Design a protein around this nucleic acid. Structure first.
Ligand SMILES: [Mg+2]
Ligand SMILES: [Mg+2]
Ligand SMILES: [Mg+2]
Ligand SMILES: [Mg+2]
Ligand SMILES: [Mg+2]
Ligand SMILES: [Mg+2]
Ligand SMILES: [Mg+2]
Ligand SMILES: [Mg+2]
Ligand SMILES: [Mg+2]
Ligand SMILES: [Mg+2]
Ligand SMILES: [Mg+2]
Ligand SMILES: [Mg+2]
Ligand SMILES: [Mg+2]
Ligand SMILES: [Mg+2]
Ligand SMILES: [Mg+2]
Ligand SMILES: [Mg+2]
Ligand SMILES: [Mg+2]
Ligand SMILES: [Mg+2]
Ligand SMILES: [Mg+2]
Ligand SMILES: [Mg+2]
Ligand SMILES: [Mg+2]
Ligand SMILES: [Mg+2]
Ligand SMILES: [Mg+2]
Ligand SMILES: [Mg+2]
Ligand SMILES: [Mg+2]
Ligand SMILES: [Mg+2]
Ligand SMILES: [Mg+2]
Ligand SMILES: [Zn+2]
Ligand SMILES: [Zn+2]
Ligand SMILES: [Zn+2]
Ligand SMILES: [Zn+2]
Ligand SMILES: [Zn+2]
Ligand SMILES: [Zn+2]
Ligand SMILES: [Zn+2]
Ligand SMILES: [Zn+2]
Ligand SMILES: [Zn+2]
Ligand SMILES: [Zn+2]
Ligand SMILES: [Zn+2]
Ligand SMILES: [Zn+2]
Ligand SMILES: [Zn+2]
Ligand SMILES: [Zn+2]
Ligand SMILES: [Zn+2]
Ligand SMILES: [Zn+2]
Ligand SMILES: [Zn+2]
Lengths: 73, 222, 92, 362, 100
RNA sequence: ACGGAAGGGCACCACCAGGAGUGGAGCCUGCGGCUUAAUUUGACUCAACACGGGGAAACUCACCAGGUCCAGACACAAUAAGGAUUGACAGAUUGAGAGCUCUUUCUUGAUUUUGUGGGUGGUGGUGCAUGGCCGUUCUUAGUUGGUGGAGUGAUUUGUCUGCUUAAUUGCGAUAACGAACGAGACCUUAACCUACUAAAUAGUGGUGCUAGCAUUUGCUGGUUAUCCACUUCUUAGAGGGACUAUCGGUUUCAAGCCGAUGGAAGUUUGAGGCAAUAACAGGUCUGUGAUGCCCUUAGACGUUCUGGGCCGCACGCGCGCUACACUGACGGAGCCAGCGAGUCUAACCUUGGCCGAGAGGUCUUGGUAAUCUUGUGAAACUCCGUCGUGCUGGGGAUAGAGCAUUGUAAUUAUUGCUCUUCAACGAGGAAUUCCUAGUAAGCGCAAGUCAUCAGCUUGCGUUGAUUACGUCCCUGCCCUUUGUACACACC
């Protein structure tokens, strides 16, 4: 036990904290009309009517489904 | 479906683990030992202690929680394990009880000589043939040493050691370190009632009844 | 220690009905006996209850015996929302 | 844990601090302590000592809910885990021709288990999907109505519902009704000639082995009479026995019933296995002596590969009473010993006239 | 009826008194019996180094546990069979009864 | 306490008379050194060095290069459901389908997160702060009160001149008397019992049934449901038996010792287990959820994952294993133990059949065991051959090629098998170890470790000598006297 030089680089790189946004749950806004649901839900009803299906690029993604519901709309 | 060798070793280790558990939790109840009796449909665990009211609790609540504890750990079915408490006799003739009482006196803050002479006087008053208590460790100084306190006579070698000497060892956790308590009690062989009533080298010659010399031949008839 | 509320509740109700709980000192076991929650979860939940005087712990050959106290049974009563002296693990 | 608060003697209940002194009830207001173990509370008034056992009866119900039980709160909880009215559930079983025969029970009636016994009528007889086999009885749930949902149909086409299929295997003719292909008993099995003809080019565009289309493999045969082009891939045609399909290179004709493929069959002794083709008529024989006890038990059977020996081995394995050992009928007939006993009688000056028998001479 | 009683303790005197009162109960009931067959005593040995660490003279130490096994064959009806298996309970003596 | 002081008595960890050796060779293994990213570490005369049960591929594991995670209780304060926080597909990144981190957004919802206090863990330090255990002084006979006696006192006597014993074991003597511990007794084991109780999990005889060879009748076998009888052999329980018995020598003629006879047994019958007082600054914090203090505690010295290392080779030491050949190697035959261990929610010990040169494979089987493996059909040994004084058919190190098994993984070869390669070594210098009868030595076997791996250990039996029956010369030990300027005590 002499010391630790840390030849591995400066990598105290601890991650986000589920990045704190503003208000969420953007369904849509309608003047004196009904609002529909953007980010259409997963076809699995285990992830039903409450989950926002992600839309990154070239795929869609689920958290309530789990990690996997890959379709190209 | 187990061999006899493994079964007997297994219930030996079960006895050892149960005794360790009971001496870990019932130290302040004067826990003096345990006995196990297997029976068709039921196995019974006899705790031999001094403060049976503290072992039991209100309506045996501590007994119920101890049965549930040993049940949950050793995977027994409901009703198959039962615990009883029993007030041990001759508390002075119990090295484990005396060692635990000395440990608690030293923890409370009694002087070492006062505690050791109290335990040796109690054991000698209880009818023992001899008592010997050893306290080892850092006593009033950083350099450790050992103190011995004896009364009566104790033997050290041979089969009578297994027959008559009961010994116990305890670790006392003082703020400067650990003291070691060793208690040896040689009981009176005469009060044994189970096994030899005397030491092997003790020889008793019975007294001959003396009869007066007759010096005259006579015949009794019917 | 972070665990779900439902299996925290499962540990607590098992403790309330039985009155005792024995947990082998084997982290990563991922399935306690008698409780369908992880062994690490039951061990750390009972350690947290031990710290606030609600349950006592004995170690004894790698098995963590836990018995809850009177303050513990009152705390778990009002935690799990049972009426006063409904059914503790103290049946005669 | 803690010192009593100064100046606070209490009523026996504790409900009231500073109890009014009562000679009649010392240290007591005298009103019920009502500490509630039973929800109602202690029946007795505040007292020195614990509360007595509850006096209020509560009512719980039997497993089916038809009857209740008024039991004292002090005991009821335990009695609760045991109450059962035992009146039969009687609920219609799923088949609807049965009612649950179970007594009052927690949970559902469960599957109908009423044995179904065919009555003594041809229509009444329970039968197979093929209808080849008629069975006297079966469990009601165990009956499996055909997935096809069609009753067994024979050449007549009369349909009698079949609730199981017989294992037997039957050959089915092509539409040409010249050549035929082996198949299994099936739900509503097709009449001979119903099946499309593989040999006919229009009816089948694939090989007999299937696997690949016939046209791709080879030019299609001009006529049904012309044999379908055989191909290297195995035909896989079902054998008459049905133990295996077929590893032979594809052939237009049906697989021959005798099999080049030999199936290992164990001898009666079982110590040896002789591989014989399927369809072999006989039980394998190994040159070793039976070496088993006769009915008398004083002799050993010397017959080679004896029919009696497998039964004898099983008989020995089964636990046998002293009486059972003595009984000749349990011992197989071939093993029974017909030799004269030739043993001294009780007098010892005479020889037993009886044939050899187990046990002491008369 | 063919029952066999197997006793497999480590305590010789308790084993022998259990065997003795079983056989005297059997002869009191006038039951034909094969006497107590005493199997070879099996000695379970464990040899260890005495030291907890590893220095000093290499002193070794053998511990042994002795298992004593007996069995008695009995031909008795079923009521005396249950009374036999209900009587003769001894601490430290492992008893098992088998039929046929 | 010591003495190159005296007297007496002892010990194969002393010698004598010898045996087997070791020291020399190759290899195995541990230690130092060197080397290294690391080659983790403790221990260094007996009383460190095949020791830490330490036979490390991962794990173990403590070391090195790197990556995670928190398993940071509890309390207080802050953030905070207009959300505290948790997780993640794909790609980038990474040895790595570790979102570890980043891009992109979904998901979770009071458990957490941040700060202060306070914990927890640590094979981190300290064995010179400790407990417990062990080793050693020290395998020898030694140690201590009470009351009397001596001395101003430390202290002494008791606890001793002789003789005796393995023994402060005894006979005795006697300012001591009576006791206690140790020794002995004891307990376990090995030897005897044709005496008791028994046994289809041990055997034997006879009768059934049956095979072969013979011929009145015999001999050798097979088969337990074929039954009967017995307990010599075998296994236990309970007992018996040895006490140095008897006789003869010798001794104040006591304790004892020597010889012969009888006896299963006559060195306390053999071998152990247990084993005092006082101590060591012996070893161990790396056995322990045994521990005080110190250190560390979230890019942790916690823990886990990946890969290395503990094995690295100029050298020097300590345990050992194979040998240098004919008192042998090889090949066929012959053909005999004892101690043991073994599978349940698992996969252990494995018979038998088949395949394969082998190692091994495969299909079954018995066994939770006095039943089955297993008569553990072991090896040395015997008997017939082959070789033939040639480093040779001695020896089998070091290499090459291939086939298998264990295991996630075998590369620095895990082991096993086959063919080929065929090195030192020609009996070992100074030194130095162990040992007195079923012992030394030879020879293998089981168990521990153990998935695999013995050249190690703990036991067991098989074959079985030579030479003492002493002494105090060397090395030590006990007791007494004596000298001392020593007292951490002759280092
Ligand atoms: Mg000598
Ligand atoms: Mg020497
Ligand atoms: Mg010499
Ligand atoms: Mg040699
Ligand atoms: Mg020495
Ligand atoms: Mg490693
Ligand atoms: Mg590692
Ligand atoms: Mg660590
Ligand atoms: Mg030390
Ligand atoms: Mg120490
Ligand atoms: Mg004096
Ligand atoms: Mg004076
Ligand atoms: Mg004196
Ligand atoms: Mg015969
Ligand atoms: Mg004489
Ligand atoms: Mg001796
Ligand atoms: Mg330690
Ligand atoms: Mg090493
Ligand atoms: Mg050594
Ligand atoms: Mg050779
Ligand atoms: Mg040979
Ligand atoms: Mg044998
Ligand atoms: Mg290895
Ligand atoms: Mg081995
Ligand atoms: Mg080793
Ligand atoms: Mg001088
Ligand atoms: Mg000085
Ligand atoms: Zn989805
Ligand atoms: Zn009142
Ligand atoms: Zn009530
Ligand atoms: Zn009341
Ligand atoms: Zn009902
Ligand atoms: Zn029905
Ligand atoms: Zn029903
Ligand atoms: Zn059919
Ligand atoms: Zn056709
Ligand atoms: Zn085809
Ligand atoms: Zn075919
Ligand atoms: Zn066929
Ligand atoms: Zn037959
Ligand atoms: Zn017959
Ligand atoms: Zn046959
Ligand atoms: Zn007649
Ligand atoms: Zn007859």
């Amino acid at each position: 036990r002499k010391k630790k030089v840390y030849t591995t680089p400066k990598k105290i790189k601890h991650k986000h904290k589920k990045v704190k946004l503003a208000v969420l749950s953007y369904y849509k806004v309608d003047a004196e009309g009904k609002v529909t649901k953007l980010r259409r839900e997963c076809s699995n009803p285990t992830c039903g009517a409450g989950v926002f299906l992600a839309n990154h690029k070239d795929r869609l993604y689920c958290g309530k489904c789990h990690s996997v519901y890959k379709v190209n709309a | 479906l187990i061999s006899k060798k493994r079964k007997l070793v297994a219930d030996g280790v079960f006895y050892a683990e149960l005794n360790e558990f009971f001496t870990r939790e019932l130290a302040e109840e004067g826990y003096s030992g345990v006995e196990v009796r297997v029976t068709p449909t039921k196995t019974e665990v006899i705790i031999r202690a001094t403060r049976t009211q503290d072992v039991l609790g209100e309506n045996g609540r501590r007994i119920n929680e101890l049965t549930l504890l040993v049940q949950k750990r050793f995977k027994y079915a409901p009703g198959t394990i039962v615990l009883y408490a029993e007030r041990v006799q001759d508390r002075g003739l119990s090295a484990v009880a005396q060692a635990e009482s000395m440990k608690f006196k030293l923890l409370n803050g009694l002087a070492i000589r006062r505690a050791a002479y109290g335990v040796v006087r109690y054991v000698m008053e209880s009818g023992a043939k001899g008592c010997e208590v050893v306290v080892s460790g850092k006593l009033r100084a950083a350099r450790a040493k050992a103190m011995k306190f004896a009364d009566g006579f104790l033997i050290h070698s041979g089969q009578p050691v297994n027959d008559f000497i009961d010994t116990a060892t305890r670790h006392v956790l003082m703020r400067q370190g650990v003291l070691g308590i060793k208690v040896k009690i040689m009981r009176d062989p005469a009060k044994s009632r189970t096994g030899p009533k005397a030491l092997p080298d003790a020889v008793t010659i019975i007294e001959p009844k003396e009869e007066e010399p007759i010096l005259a031949p006579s015949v009794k008839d019917y | 220690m972070l665990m779900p509320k439902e299996d925290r509740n499962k540990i607590h109700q098992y403790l309330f009905q039985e009155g005792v709980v024995v947990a082998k000192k084997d982290f990563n076991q991922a399935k306690h006996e008698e409780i369908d929650t992880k062994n690490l979860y039951v061990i750390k939940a009972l350690q947290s209850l031990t710290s606030k005087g609600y349950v006592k712990t004995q170690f004894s050959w790698q098995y963590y015996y836990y018995t809850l106290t009177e303050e513990g049974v009152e705390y778990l009563r009002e935690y799990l929302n049972l009426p006063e002296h409904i059914v503790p693990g103290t049946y005669i | 844990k803690r010192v009593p608060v100064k100046n606070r003697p209490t009523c026996w209940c504790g409900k009231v601090v500073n109890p009014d002194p009562n000679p009649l009830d010392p240290n007591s207001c005298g009103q019920t302590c009502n500490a509630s173990t039973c929800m109602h509370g202690c029946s007795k008034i505040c007292h020195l000592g614990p509360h007595p056992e509850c006096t209020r009866m509560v009512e719980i119900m039997c497993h089916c809910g038809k009857h209740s039980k008024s039991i004292f709160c002090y005991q009821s909880k335990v009695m609760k885990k045991n109450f059962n009215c035992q009146e039969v559930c009687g609920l219609p079983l799923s088949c609807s021709i049965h009612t649950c025969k179970k007594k009052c029970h927690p949970g559902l009636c469960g599957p109908c288990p009423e044995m179904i016994i065919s009555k003594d009528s041809p229509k009444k007889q329970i039968k197979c999907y093929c209808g080849n086999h008629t069975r006297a009885n079966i469990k009601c749930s165990e009956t499996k109505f055909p997935k096809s949902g069609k009753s067994s149909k024979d050449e007549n086409g009369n349909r009698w519902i079949g609730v199981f299929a017989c294992a037997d295997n039957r050959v089915v003719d092509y539409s040409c009704r010249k050549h035929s292909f082996i198949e299994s008993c099936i739900s509503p099995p097709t009449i001979n000639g119903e099946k499309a003809c593989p040999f006919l080019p229009s009816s089948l565009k694939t090989c007999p082995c299937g696997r690949t289309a016939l046209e791709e493999l080879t030019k299609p045969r001009k006529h049904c009479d012309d044999p379908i082009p055989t191909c290297d891939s195995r035909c896989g045609k079902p054998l008459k026995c049905g133990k295996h399909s077929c590893p032979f290179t594809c052939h237009d004709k049906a697989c021959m019933e005798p099999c080049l493929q030999i199936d290992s069959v164990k001898c009666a002794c079982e110590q040896s296995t002789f591989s014989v083709p399927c369809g072999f008529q006989g039980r394998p024989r190994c040159n070793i002596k039976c070496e088993s006890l006769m009915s008398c038990r004083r002799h050993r059977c010397t017959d080679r590969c004896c029919s009696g020996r497998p039964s004898a081995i099983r008989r020995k394995k089964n636990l046998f009473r002293t009486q059972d050992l003595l009984d000749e009928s349990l011992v197989e007939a071939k093993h029974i010993c017909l030799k004269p006993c030739n043993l001294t009688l009780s007098c010892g000056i005479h020889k037993c006239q009886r044939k050899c028998h187990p046990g002491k001479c008369p | 009826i063919k029952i066999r009683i197997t006793l497999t303790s480590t305590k010789v005197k308790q084993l022998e008194n259990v065997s003795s009162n079983i056989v005297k109960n059997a002869e009191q009931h006038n039951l034909v019996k094969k006497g107590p067959v005493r199997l070879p005593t099996k000695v379970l040995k464990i040899s260890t180094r005495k030291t907890p660490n590893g220095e000093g003279s290499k002193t070794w130490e053998t511990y042994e546990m002795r298992i004593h096994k007996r069995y008695i064959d009995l031909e008795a009806p079923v009521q005396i069979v249950k009374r036999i298996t209900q009587i003769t309970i001894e601490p430290g003596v492992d008893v098992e009864v088998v039929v046929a």
